[PDB]
Amino acid sequence: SEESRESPAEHGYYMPAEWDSHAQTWIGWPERQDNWRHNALPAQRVFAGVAKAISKFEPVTVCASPAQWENARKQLPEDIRVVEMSMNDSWFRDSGPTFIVRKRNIAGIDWNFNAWGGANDGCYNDWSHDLLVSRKILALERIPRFQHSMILEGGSIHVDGEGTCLVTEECLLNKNRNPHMSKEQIEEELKKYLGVQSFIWLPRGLYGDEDTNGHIDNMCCFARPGVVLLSWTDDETDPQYERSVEALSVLSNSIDARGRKIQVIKLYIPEPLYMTEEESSGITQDGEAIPRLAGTRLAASYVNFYIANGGIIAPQFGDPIRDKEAIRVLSDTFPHHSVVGIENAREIVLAGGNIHCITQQQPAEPT
Numbered sequence: 001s002e003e004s005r006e007s008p009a010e011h012g013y014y015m016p017a018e019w020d021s022h023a024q025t026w027i028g029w030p031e032r033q034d035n036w037r038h039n040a041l042p043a044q045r046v047f048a049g050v051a052k053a054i055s056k057f058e059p060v061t062v063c064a065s066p067a068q069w070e071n072a073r074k075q076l077p078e079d080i081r082v083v084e085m086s087m088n089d090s091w092f093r094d095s096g097p098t099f100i101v102r103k104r105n106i107a108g109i110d111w112n113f114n115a116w117g118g119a120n121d122g123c124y125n126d127w128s129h130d131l132l133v134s135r136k137i138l139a140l141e142r143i144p145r146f147q148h149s150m151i152l153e154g155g156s157i158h159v160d161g162e163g164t165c166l167v168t169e170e171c172l173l174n175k176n177r178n179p180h181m182s183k184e185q186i187e188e189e190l191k192k193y194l195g196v197q198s199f200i201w202l203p204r205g206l207y208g209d210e211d212t213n214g215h216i217d218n219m220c221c222f223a224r225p226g227v228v229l230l231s232w233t234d235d236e237t238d239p240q241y242e243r244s245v246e247a248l249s250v251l252s253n254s255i256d257a258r259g260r261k262i263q264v265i266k267l268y269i270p271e272p273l274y275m276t277e278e279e280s281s282g283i284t285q286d287g288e289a290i291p292r293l294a295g296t297r298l299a300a301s302y303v304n305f306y307i308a309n310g311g312i313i314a315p316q317f318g319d320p321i322r323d324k325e326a327i328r329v330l331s332d333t334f335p336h337h338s339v340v341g342i343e344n345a346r347e348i349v350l351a352g353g354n355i356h357c358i359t360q361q362q363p364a365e366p367t
């Protein structure tokens, strides 16, 4: 697939910050038995709970496969729209479109996609349906579409809506993504497509986040211009510690696109979590996806929350201090939003991501 003849930036578009006004949220529906234990049922109920929480703030559409449409329609309240859509898995932060707006005044970017690392390093062996998800979503809404040839997922990029793009090297410079492109070329395309002017490159993402090779959205995100929330631990024996300290070092020497120094709020990860034998035993091995093994360190961070209209939808991992700390810190950081916790978010992390990874915001169209 080739590139649109003109970029978003050439038409005045840019990607707004996640905390700007939404028209709705898009979410996919999990099903594949070699990624979601017990026929996906525990995860489906958590997805449904996330969708329902977001629906209290703004409209939601859930997309479910032909096989699943009736199941999703039963499991979701009636004010959530459910539409039929083929997909190889349910991570719409990554396979869905990255919306852009201008002051038609909304468009969507359809990045190329390879299941987070392709034939030799990706999470499953067929992403043919996933390749059409963005086209189908934008067609459903009648929103124009820019197409890129470069591989990218929405979970790998974060913006402040003021010209800054926060990314990780571990992901976007990985040879499993766009090995034909340099760092500078990748920057130029993101300027052209996101409407950004400058970058903050963290070297690495969250420890344990092998699915995505260190997506930024599981490591660090903006809370508002000039302020980030960073996954943190004080425990020097956790391999997360050296990643967090290194990110802190970079951020505390970083300037945003408008010349601000970055202030960092630490958001402590839960006490380390590991997949149980009982969890792993509910997952099939059909030779189509990466294995899910007992003992794996879960890539769990409260940074993988989602911002909706007046709501923050945050994971809860069962940790008897870090869950409530995360709710408090987020409540203080977003004092005009209601902070909602989602219990059993572990069910999503077992499969490689969390709340932010299963959502994709559709901005309100400026008038």
Ligand SMILES: [Cl-]
Binding pocket: 077
């Ligand atoms: Cl209800």
Ligand SMILES: [Cl-]
Binding pocket: 225, 226
């Ligand atoms: Cl400011």
Ligand SMILES: [Cl-]
Binding pocket: 291, 292, 293, 296
């Ligand atoms: Cl694993």
Ligand SMILES: [Mg+2]
Binding pocket: 095, 096, 110, 111, 112, 113, 130, 131, 134, 135
């Ligand atoms: Mg795409």
Ligand code: NA
Binding pocket: 208, 209, 210, 296, 297, 298, 299
């Ligand atoms: Na892991």
Ligand code: NA
Binding pocket: 116, 117, 121, 122, 123, 210, 211, 212, 213
């Ligand atoms: Na990967």
Ligand code: NA
Binding pocket: 294, 295
């Ligand atoms: Na063990």
